[PDB]
């Protein structure tokens, strides 16, 4: 149907933000001449200074029948020859999908001698996150074998991929709280890996999963082939960060210890600036980990009640539902952004904290407005040190969340006290 | 001969609504050109724009019928939401031309329940067959047939010219003593106007070459010029035209003597800061040779290589032959063998896609993005000046940085 | 319990940083050092940046080291911010701890400053300063300063004094009006636009408890306070005007009925919020003399217990009947040491604490609840409208741990 | 004499009490009146502080002059004493107090507690508040920092860090993070986290570094001749100048520069292609000396900008401010008045405008893109989230917290152009 905003791109997108975040991948993609601005994406929104190593065959309308199938051929062998990759997937772009040229064929064809993962992946019902979840599971299927374990105890951190809220600042305060508690992290991917990392990924005794939109299924994989289990929680506020502690002290066997004294948001939040904090409405939509952490910090220690709660995940829909419940309200799963307009003039909250779509729709509508999701544009991706997750996580949460709040108290204020026009004189008329 | 870096020609549209108010873009292309038109001028999303994607289910591929009918109901849906729309454009995504939708008959069928006020256009945005502004090229030409005929006569000024350029090229023609200024990217539909046998049409963007083709078949002649970069390419256009209308030359001169000394002042104020500097160019909008012209014979640059999507010799020849023996052409664009012609040639500014602008600037090399002067006013006498300070930006800021 | 070992109170100058709300015709001079300066922007904050009319010279080494040269430089100053500001024609030059400690005669200054400006601009002064008043006397000494130049009136007429929101005066002139007796004047009429005619003939009443210069400003010219308990709470206000209907000789019946659907959306919205503050116990320190009236409503119409109440200054002729109207329960206290009464908070476990926001913070981090009376007198609390709010001020149902 | 609607510094106690809160076993007794007992407020408040500040006021009043004054203040200093139990005591004046005959030395002396006390004199009508502070670091310095034997391992103390200060409590967490980069050990951070032990064994040091110079540039430099203590000139905010402070740290203790380029990310954004519209931007600096200093030199050199104001609040700083300004070929406005500030910016218009709260404001009045990089704030600049000002991480924080203005700004200009 009509479409004019889409929280959820085409699969490649995601398959290639696991590849540009995984080094030495090179993703060949079947795609037209025209299909290359997620390159441009990646160089702006991350800017990242080298190129995405994604080749492109960008057919043409000549090229078509017999001539697609060699240059497919011809993409794959000098992308191999030009760049000396370790490993190579083949996937296929929404159009190429249409006409029946199987990759793996093309691929199997030229023997490389580098491992080729191939994937598969409808381009039309599915979304990126489903790209980047299935790409993960490929290389994890391929490159990932059982073997023998770390003496000491280690952990592996899957879930942060390139083009992610605020990854790069997450990682490392999670291996901060790792190294703090004594463990090490054996392998950390997609971000900063190796397919020797990937081939080294079982090693650990445990795992951990950050971003289940896309670490979910190779947490699973690992379960079961590896043998590993993996965290059920995400340490988003100082509560989850608790439980997180708690639940991989537990999975390693050693002592639980935390950093407190870096944590201020309980005295920042118990201090009367906060006293008109309390009784605040917030409607939060984005991501499903994202939007739940949040609600959950929002409701203990933001001093919020939700008013309304969404995502954009179809496949994360019952977990969303079922914390719902818990909170009173009902969940909003969609894509299209007129069904969130209309929620959001209905309810009429006082604080808006979602994607770019979020923020500027309260623009809009003159309500203090946050980014706590995914779908963001440049000026969301900033240079300093700003995780979303640990105690850490918990001050930037803090201020992130009343920066616009402290905003509009300061605007109003001045506007209410030069206040134009001061008669009132029925006041002793 | 390899992989190229473009965007499809979606990208136009982009610019084509704001060139005519009245004019909606119904893509029917996949999440994937919905994707590309939406992590794309992200201001406009937020603020209503007139384009959107017909995203196609399972069923709406093998099922040809039904897409189309479908198809229709957003048409008739559109109007509630927008009653300002007059003339709607379908345009062909690359799903759409690999399932073979026939959007001409669409739009036929489309304009029989509509009238007689609203009218739909089809024309192609996709990367297969068309490349960046080569979409604009198919959009005017889609529009061109449908104009009427007359036998007045009549200067066209084709091309999505920026409205305050637009303003100052009409006040100048007419103050030159050329009467019709009559645009074919016309504001509203109410202002399009009739082509004839005597209808003479000048070219503004170089990328227009169906537009030129399409007014050929119509009757209309064109006038062979330089375009419009910088002041003294201005002069020979606005000279051709006074010949073309037989305008004088007295009259010329003492129209284009006040501009010209500013346009030649602003110029030479940022020429400086980019003085003596070595600038490499990548295929990206087919307006290359054009600006590499006025580089090199008014700002005084020595360019190393100039690549274009593809070239039109007929329309663009003045600038050709304007242009310096010293630079070699390039038909098409394969980024790797490029990138190593750059890596080799050592330029000291590169304009090229944005893609390859963040990879280029960590190697060490100053780049600048060629899709500013598509988008921002570069053209005719009081830009410039503008379009010199777009190209002494980075090299200052380079410098500025390191050391 | 007066010990005075330790104290944790605000200049009457804080006053001046809501009293130029009331009279947007009025520009306030402050002869003060740069700590006074500090003060005054500090707990305005934002106000500053709005330019209001606190004009905080610093007292330097040159005009302090003389007396004379300030003198001079008082009337040149005067000019200056005259030129600045046409519309302004009050002005106040409000007393300062080194304008007192140097001893500048601010009365005689101020007097031929009005003298030589003449009729048009008009300037009236007083002393705000912590060394003889504190907090709130500075706007009964502001009014009580302005008292004497107010004309006499031979007309009876009810009675408004205190600084007050404007919709709250507004709604407390409805409200008189609805009695249909009792012409309103306005003391700290509204930039002074109806200079307010004060006599022997206008008996008044008192909305703010603080005020206690005002009852001898009222009582120079003749008028008389009237026993009325203070409008807080619902009942508070009721009592109230049932005291104003009784001075004016209106009929109980009359007035009983004609205030009912008010008072029914006051206990509405007073019952919204005191099932938050039900069996809990409060401690009260000396920040405002707003207290014992907060002290009554919370413990009678929100169920409330108070444990202590303390007052820096009990003017006990007018607040008898709160005194009355409050239970035995809490014990009065007329300025105590921080330091013992903070012995007794601690003693006494109070679930909520009413405090200034000096204190606030560290009771906090001890586990106690705290809220600051410094909001308050910038929050309207004073009517039927804002009877509901009152008790929300003091919800505070945080309970995050 | 002169009319001031909104200041940049406060009385010198207020610096005073800022040092003497930041470390802990001190007490601050005021020579108060009563009413100016609200400087606690702000450090409650404005810092977040859990504690109550380590100070006592008498809080005279009218009925209390000449004996009873006195009477008052040995009881305040006696109680303080028996109930705060403080290692060190100090006794100060406030601006009412030094005009009253009281003599706070001479009251001090009479109570002869055994705990060491200290007279500051302090010219509350010559001098403002960080001068205050200053003092009252050198002169604790010299009651209880005395000459004593090296370190085993080199040593630096960190000098300027007090409360109420900008960031503080995260550029000393930065420097020590760095300093640990080379891994030479802090002896001692002070006054932010300094006790009479610490002061004590402040003489400890191989070296001295100057945080911040307002607040510790005397105590620096009676170090160096009382205790032979090497202080370093150059403060690191942003990247070069952190470069030029690791080179000089590493020449003074010896040992390899081992400096750590890895989080910085700074340059790569400054030089990224999406921001090259930053050059050719003017700017007007106004507020702390040093960071004026700093912030002009990195916005002149790393980030394009061009330094179109300068000035500083901080006069005892006028002649660092007047040699950067000549050296960026500016003019100097070295007014404590947000007036004239306030004509500067009108004058210029800069672009983009980068001082303290008074700009902020200014800016927000005059439509222009504004950021705090200065002391005087309200509560909300002091973020939870830790943010240094200096250092590698302070590069990108200053980067980013510069960048904010001016995209929301042309953001909302191109919202603007495009629904029309
Ligand atoms: C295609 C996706 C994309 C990305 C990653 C950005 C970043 C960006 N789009 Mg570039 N903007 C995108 C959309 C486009 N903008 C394009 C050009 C353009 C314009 C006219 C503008 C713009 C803007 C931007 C900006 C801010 C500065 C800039 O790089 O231009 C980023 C990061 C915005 C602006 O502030 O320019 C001064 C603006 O007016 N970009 C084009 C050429 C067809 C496209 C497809
Ligand atoms: C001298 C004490 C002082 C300081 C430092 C401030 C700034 C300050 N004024 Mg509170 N303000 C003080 C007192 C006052 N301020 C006032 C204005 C005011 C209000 C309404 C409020 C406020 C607040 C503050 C704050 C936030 C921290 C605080 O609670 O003190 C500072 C630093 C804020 C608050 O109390 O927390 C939610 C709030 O709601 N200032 C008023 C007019 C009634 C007074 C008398
Ligand atoms: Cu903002
Ligand atoms: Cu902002």
Redesign the interface.
């Given at each position: 149907?009509?479409?004019?905003?889409?929280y959820?791109?085409?699969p490649?997108?995601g398959a290639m933000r696991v590849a540009t975040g995984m080094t030495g991948m090179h993703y060949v993609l079947h795609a037209?001449?025209?299909?290359?601005?997620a390159?441009?994406?990646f160089?702006?929104i991350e800017?990242?200074?080298?190129?995405?190593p994604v080749?492109?065959?960008?057919?043409?309308?000549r090229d078509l029948g017999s001539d697609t199938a060699e240059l497919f051929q011809?993409?794959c062998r000098?992308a191999y020859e030009?760049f000396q990759p370790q490993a190579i997937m083949v996937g296929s772009?929404?159009?190429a999908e249409?006409?029946q040229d199987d990759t793996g064929g093309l691929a199997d064809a030229l023997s490389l001698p580098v491992p080729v993962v191939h994937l598969e992946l409808?381009?039309?019902?599915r979304?990126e996150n489903f790209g980047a979840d299935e790409s993960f599971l490929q290389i994890c299927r391929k490159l990932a074998r059982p073997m023998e374990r770390t003496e000491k105890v280690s952990c592996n951190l899957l879930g942060p991929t390139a083009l992610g809220f605020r990854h790069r600042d997450d990682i490392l305060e999670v291996t901060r709280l790792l190294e703090g508690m004594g463990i090490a992290v054996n392998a950390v991917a997609p971000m900063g890996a190796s397919p020797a990392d990937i081939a080294r990924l079982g090693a650990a005794h445990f795992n951990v999963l950050l971003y289940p939109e896309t670490g979910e299924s190779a947490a699973r994989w690992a379960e079961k082939t590896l043998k590993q289990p993996y965290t059920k929680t995400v340490p988003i506020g100082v509560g989850a960060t608790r439980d997180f502690v708690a639940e991989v002290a537990a999975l390693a066997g050693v002592a639980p210890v935390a950093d407190d004294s870096?944590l201020?948001?309980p005295?920042?939040?118990?201090?009367?600036?906060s006293?008109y904090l309390?009784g605040k409405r917030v409607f939060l939509f984005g991501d499903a980990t994202h939007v739940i952490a949040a609600a959950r910090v929002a409701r203990?220690?933001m001093?919020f009640e939700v008013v309304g709660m969404g995502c954009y995940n179809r496949e994360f829909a019952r977990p969303m539902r079922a914390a719902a419940k818990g909170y009173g309200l009902e969940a909003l799963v969609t894509d299209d952004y007129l069904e969130v307009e209309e929620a959001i003039q209905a309810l009429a909250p006082e604080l808006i904290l979602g994607t770019?779509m979020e923020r500027?729709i309260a623009?809009?509508l003159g309500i203090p407005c946050a980014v706590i999701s995914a779908p963001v544009?440049?000026?969301d991706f900033?240079?300093?040190?700003?995780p979303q997750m640990g105690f850490?996580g918990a001050?930037?949460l803090?201020?992130?969340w009343?920066?616009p709040l402290?905003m509009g108290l300061?605007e109003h204020?001045?506007t209410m006290?030069?206040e134009d026009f001061?008669?009132?004189?029925?006041?002793?008329? | 001969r390899?992989?190229?870096?473009?965007?499809?020609?979606?990208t136009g549209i982009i610019w084509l609504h704001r060139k005519m108010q009245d004019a909606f873009f119904?893509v029917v292309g996949?999440?994937?050109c919905?994707?590309?038109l939406?992590?794309?001028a992200?201001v406009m999303?937020?603020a209503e724009?007139r384009?959107?994607?017909?995203?196609?289910?399972?069923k709406d591929?093998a099922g040809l019928a039904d897409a189309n009918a479908?198809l229709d109901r957003?048409v008739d849906?559109?109007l509630a939401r927008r009653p300002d729309i007059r003339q709607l454009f379908l345009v062909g995504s690359?799903?759409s031309?690999?399932?073979k939708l026939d959007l001409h008959r669409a739009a036929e069928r489309l304009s029989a329940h509509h009238g007689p006020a609203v009218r739909v256009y089809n024309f192609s945005g996709?990367?297969?067959?068309t490349?960046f502004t080569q979409g604009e090229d198919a959009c005017l030409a889609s529009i061109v047939p449908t104009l009427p005929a007359t036998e007045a006569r009549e200067l066209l000024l084709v091309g999505a010219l920026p409205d305050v350029v637009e303003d100052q090229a009409v006040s100048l023609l007419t103050q030159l003593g050329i009467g019709p200024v009559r645009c074919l990217p016309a504001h509203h539909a109410a202002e399009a106007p009739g082509v004839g046998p005597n209808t003479v049409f000048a070219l503004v963007q170089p990328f227009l070459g169906d537009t030129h083709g399409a007014l050929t078949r119509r009757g209309a002649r064109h006038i062979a010029a330089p375009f419009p970069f910088g002041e003294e390419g201005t002069t020979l256009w606005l000279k051709a035209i006074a010949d073309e209308f037989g305008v004088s030359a007295e009259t010329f001169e003492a129209v284009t003597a006040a501009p010209r000394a500013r346009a030649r002042k602003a110029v030479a104020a940022a020429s400086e800061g980019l003085r003596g500097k070595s600038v490499f160019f990548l295929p990206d909008s087919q307006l290359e040779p054009s600006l590499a012209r006025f580089l090199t014979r008014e700002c005084g640059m020595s360019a190393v290589e100039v690549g274009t999507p593809f070239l039109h010799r007929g329309i663009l020849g003045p600038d050709l032959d304007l242009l310096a023996e010293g630079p070699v052409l390039s038909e098409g664009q394969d980024v790797?063998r490029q990138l190593d012609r750059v890596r080799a040639a050592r330029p000291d500014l590169t304009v090229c896609?944005?893609?390859?602008?963040?990879?280029l600037?960590?190697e060490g090399f100053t780049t600048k993005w060629a899709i500013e002067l598509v988008f921002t006013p570069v053209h005719f006498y009081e830009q410039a000046g503008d379009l010199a300070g777009l190209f002494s930006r980075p090299v200052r800021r380079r410098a500025i940085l390191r050391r």
């Open positions: 149907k009509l479409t004019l905003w889409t959820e791109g085409p490649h997108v037209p001449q025209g299909d290359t601005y390159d441009l994406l160089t702006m800017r990242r200074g080298k190129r995405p080749s492109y065959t960008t057919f043409q309308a011809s993409a000098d030009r772009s929404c159009t249409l006409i409808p381009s039309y019902q979304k870096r201020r948001q005295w920042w939040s118990a201090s009367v600036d006293t309390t203990d220690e001093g770019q500027h623009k809009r544009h440049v000026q900033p240079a300093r040190y700003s850490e001050n930037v803090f201020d992130t009343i920066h402290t300061e204020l001045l006290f030069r001061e008669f009132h004189d029925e006041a002793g008329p | 390899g992989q190229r870096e473009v965007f499809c020609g979606l119904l996949s999440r994937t919905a994707h590309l939406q992590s794309a992200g999303i937020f724009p384009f959107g994607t017909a995203v196609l289910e399972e591929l479908e957003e849906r559109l690359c799903p031309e690999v399932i996709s990367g297969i067959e490349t790797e896609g944005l893609g390859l602008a963040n990879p600037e960590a």
